[PDB]
Amino acid sequence: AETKIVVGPQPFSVGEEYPWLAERDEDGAVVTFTGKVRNHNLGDSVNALTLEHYPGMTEKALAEIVDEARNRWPLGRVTVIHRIGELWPGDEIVFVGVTSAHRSSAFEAGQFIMDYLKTRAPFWKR
Amino acid sequence: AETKIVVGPQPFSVGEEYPWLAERDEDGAVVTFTGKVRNALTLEHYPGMTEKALAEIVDEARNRWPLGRVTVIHRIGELWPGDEIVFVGVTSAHRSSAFEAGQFIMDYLKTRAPFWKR
Numbered sequence: 001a002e003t004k005i006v007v008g009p010q011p012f013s014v015g016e017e018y019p020w021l022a023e024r025d026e027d028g029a030v031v032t033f034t035g036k037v038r039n040h041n042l043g044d045s046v047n048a049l050t051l052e053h054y055p056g057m058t059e060k061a062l063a064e065i066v067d068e069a070r071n072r073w074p075l076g077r078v079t080v081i082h083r084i085g086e087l088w089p090g091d092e093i094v095f096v097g098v099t100s101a102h103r104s105s106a107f108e109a110g111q112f113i114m115d116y117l118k119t120r121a122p123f124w125k126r
Numbered sequence: 127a128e129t130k131i132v133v134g135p136q137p138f139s140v141g142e143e144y145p146w147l148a149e150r151d152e153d154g155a156v157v158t159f160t161g162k163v164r165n166a167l168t169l170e171h172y173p174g175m176t177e178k179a180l181a182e183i184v185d186e187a188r189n190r191w192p193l194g195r196v197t198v199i200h201r202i203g204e205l206w207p208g209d210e211i212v213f214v215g216v217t218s219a220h221r222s223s224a225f226e227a228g229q230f231i232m233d234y235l236k237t238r239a240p241f242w243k244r
C-alpha cells in the first residue's frame with residue numbers, strides 16, 4: 001500500500017490524482033476530501049492567505065499522520081497533497097485520498113488525517 | 127444548490143465529475159466516495175422509482191446538513207471486478223457536514239435503495 005505526499009506552490013488537479021489513488025482492485029472503497037480557502041479563512045474583505053511550510057519537516061509530519069492512520073485502519077493507497085504560497089478564496093489547497101476494503105474505514109481515516117493535519121502539521125499562515 | 131442524479135450502464139469518471147461538484151467558492155469542502163465491485167455481476171434497478179429515491183435521500187441530507195452541490199451516480203448492467211459502480215459527491219463549507227452527509231447517503235443507498243443483483 002503506497003503513500004504519496006507532496007507539498008508545493010503549484011495548483012494540483014483532483015482529476016490527475018484520482019486515477020492513481022483508485023487504481024488497485026483490492027482498494028474497493030475510495031474517499032477523497034478537497035479543502036479550499038474559505039471566505040471565513042479571511043472574514044474581512046479579500047486579501048490573500050499566504051501559507052509557508054517547513055521543507056522536510058512538514059512532509060515528515062504528514063508522513064507520520066498517515067502512518068498513525070495505518071495503525072488504526074486497514075488502508076490501501078493514500079495521497080496527501082498540500083498547496084502553499086499566496087492563495088485566495090476558492091483555491092484548492094489540500095487533498096486527502098484514502099482507500100480501503102470497507103467504506104467506514106476510508107471515511108473515518110480520511111477525517112482523522114484531515115483533523116490531525118490541521119492541528120499537527122507545521123505550517124505558518126499570514 | 128443543485129443536485130445531479132444519474133443512473134445508467136455507462137462508465138463514469140471521477141475526474142470529469144469533480145470540477146462541477148467543486149465549482150462554487152462557498153462549497154469549500156468537497157467529499158467524495160467511490161464504491162467498486164469487491165464472474166459478471168448484473169445490477170438492476172426500478173426505472174424511475176430509484177432516481178426518485180436517490181433524490182429523496184439527498185433532500186433528507188439537505189434537511190440535516192448545510193450542503194452545496196451534490197452528485198450521486200450509480201451504474202447498472204454488467205459489471206466486473208474493479209469497476210467503479212457508485213459515486214457520491216457532497217460539498218459544504220464545513221468538513222463534518224460533508225463527511226456525515228456523504229456517509230448518510232451511502233448507508234441509505236446500500237441498505238434501502240432499489241438496486242439488486244439479477
Ligand code: NA
Nearest residue numbers: 090091092149
Ligand atoms: Na475553486
